[model samples]
Target: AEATQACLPVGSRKNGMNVNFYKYSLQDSTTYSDPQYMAYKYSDTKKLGSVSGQTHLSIYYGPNTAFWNTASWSSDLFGFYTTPTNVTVEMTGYFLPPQTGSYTFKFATVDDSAILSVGGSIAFECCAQEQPPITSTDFTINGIKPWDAAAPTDIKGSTYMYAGYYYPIKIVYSNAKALARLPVSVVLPDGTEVNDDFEGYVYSFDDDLSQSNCTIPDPS
Candidate 1:
C-alpha cells in the first residue's frame, strides 16, 4: 500500500488581509469607563455583530462635534456608522507583512482611546480624554520563504522571495467623546513609511480565534 498525505484544499490559501468591525452602543457616557460592559460584549460566547469591507485602518473626522450626529457621516475609512456619539468601534484583523525586517508601528489618537496588538502582544496604546504624543512599537519578522528553488532573491533576501507571513492585529477603539482622530503608520526597515491612508497593505479578516492568546483582555 502507498502512503497518503493530507493537503490544503485548492484555492483555500488566503494571502490578503481582512478586517472585521464590531459596533456597540455606549449610551450617554462621554467617555468609555465601563470595563464590565465592554467585556460582556467581547465575551467568547457573545455573538457580536460586525461591519464589513474595511480596507484602511486610519480615521480622520476632524474636530467638528456636529459631524458625529450627521447620518451622512462617512465611514469610508472605518466601514461602520459613526453617529450618535455613543457608539464604540472595535476593529480586529490580521496584518500581512510586506517584507521581513525591523518595522515600527505608529499610532496617534485624539479624544478617544486606541489600542493595537500584534501577534498577541500589546504593541501600542493611546488613552482617551488625553492627547498623548504619538507612540510606536518596533518588531521584526522573517516573512515567507521561497517555495521555488530557482526563484530570484536579489530583492527580498537570500532565503525569502516574498513577504507572505501574517501577524494577528487587533485594534480596540472608543469615541465616547466629541472629536476623534486615529492615524496609524508603519515604517519599514528600509525607511519606507506606509500610512493607513494609502491602503499600503492588505490585512486578513479570517478568524484565527486560536491565536487569541494575548495576555491582555479585549477591552483592555
Candidate 2:
C-alpha cells in the first residue's frame, strides 16, 4: 500500500545546484515606520563582501537592534543563519498549488530559530531561542489546490496575489539545512526495511532530502 504525503507549493527559485533566491521587498516604503520589501542574503561561502556563488539568502528589514529582540520580530522577515557552510536553506522557497489537495511540511533546527509564512498567510511557526537543545517539529495543511495545473510554482508566484489568488497557503519552515539534513526514505514498523546503505544518498536542498545526498556515505 502507498501512503500519501501532502505536498506544498514551492515558491523558491533555483539559481544553481545549491542556490535559491527570494524577492523580499515588493514595494517601496514611503516611511521608515512602514514595513517595506527587503531581500536578505546568505551563503556557504566564507569570503567577506562576496555574493557570487553564495548558498543562502536572508530577508532582514528592522533596525540593527532588531536581531537582539526576539520578542518583537520573531515572526517578521529578517536575517537568517545557515549551517554546513555551503548548503541552501531548505526553508527558502515559495509554494504553488497545482491541484486541490492537502500538503504537509516539517521543520527542524539547532542553536537558532526560524519561521514560515505560506502565501502571505502564517500557517505554522516555531522559536528556538528559549528552548535548550532545539528539536524538530512538523506542521501539515489540508486544503484544495487553487490552480488546475495551468501555471507552475514560482518563487514569487501570482497565486500568492489577488486576481490570481488561486493557491491556499500551507506550512513553511525557517531553517532549511538543519531540519531537512537527514535521509527521508520510509522505514517499516517491523524493525526491518530496505537499505540504500550500499550506494547511499545525496543530500542537497536542490537534491534529495537525505544525509547521503552530500556525495558521501553515512558512517554507520
Candidate 3:
C-alpha cells in the first residue's frame, strides 16, 4: 500500500484550466414579477376564463390564488395558446369560417414555443429560448371554412411557451365573396389604407376602422 503513492506538479498537464468566467449584475435595477397572464376583463367585465364572441382566445400565467397560497396555472389567450402546461382541449378551438376559401395563421415566439400550421402544409414548428424580448411571426389560414359550399371543415393551431415571453400571432383568410375584394386594412402614422387598395394582407392596427373585422385579422 505504501508503494501506491503518487505526486503531481502545479502546472502539470494533469491539472485542468478554469475557463468559466461569466457574471451578471442583479442590481441592474430591473426586476419582473412572476409570469402573469394578460388581463381578461373588459369594462369591468370578468372576461378571463371563458369562450365567447368577445373573447374567443386568451393566455397567461398566474398563481392558483393571486398571492402565493396555491400553484400557478396557465391561462388561455383568445383560446389560441396556453402556458408551459399541456395544450388541452380547454386551451384550443376551431376557426369556423362564414364561407369557403383558404386561410392562414402565423405566430412567433421569443422563447420555447411551437406552431400547428393550419391546413395546407400541415407544419409543426418550435423556437428555442433567449433574452427578454420575444415575438412570433404572423399566422395565416387559407382553405374552406366550417360552413362553406365545399363543406364544413375545422382549422386550428396552438403555441407552448414560458412566462415573461411574448408571442405575436395573426390569422388571415380568403372567401369567395371576400377574395381579392377582401376588406382588410392597416394604418401607419403616415396614413390609413384599405385592403381593396392596400395591396396585400399586411396591415397594422393603428387606424380608425383598421381594427375592425374583415379589415383586420381576427385573434380567435
Task: Score each candidate by Cα lDDT.
Answer: 0.40, 0.22, 0.21
User: Could you list the CA RMSD of all candidates, in the order they appear?
Assistant: 15.0, 17.9, 25.8
Deviation (Å) of 50 in candidate 1: 2.6
Q: Which ten residues in a row have the lowest lDDT in candidate 1?
A: 1-10
| Per-residue lDDT of candidate 1, residues 1-220 (tens digit) | 1111111111223433333333434333422433333322332222234554455666666435555543334454355544424344555444555665555666543334444445433222211101111232322211111222321221221111124443444455545434456666677767787777434353433332333232222221
Top candidate on lDDT is 1
Error of 1 at 192 (Å): 1.5
Best by TM-score: 1
Residue 16 in candidate 2, Cα distance off native in Å: 9.1
Q: Is candidate 2 or candidate 3 better by lDDT?
A: 2
Residue pairs in candidate 1 whose N, alpha carbon or C atoms collide under 3 angstroms: 17-203, 17-204, 18-203, 18-204, 18-205
Candidate 3 per-residue lDDT, tens place, 1-220, comes to 1111111111111111111111111221111110111110111222223332222221233334433322223333233332222221111112222222222232211111122222111111111111121222223323212231332223333232222211222222211110111122222223332222212221111112221222111222
TM-score of each: 0.54, 0.23, 0.21
Candidates ranked by TM-score: 1, 2, 3
Which of the two candidates, 1 or 2, achieves a greater lDDT against the reference?
Answer: 1
Candidate 1: where are CA atoms >4 Å away?
Answer: 1-48, 62-77, 82-84, 120-163, 198-200, 205-220
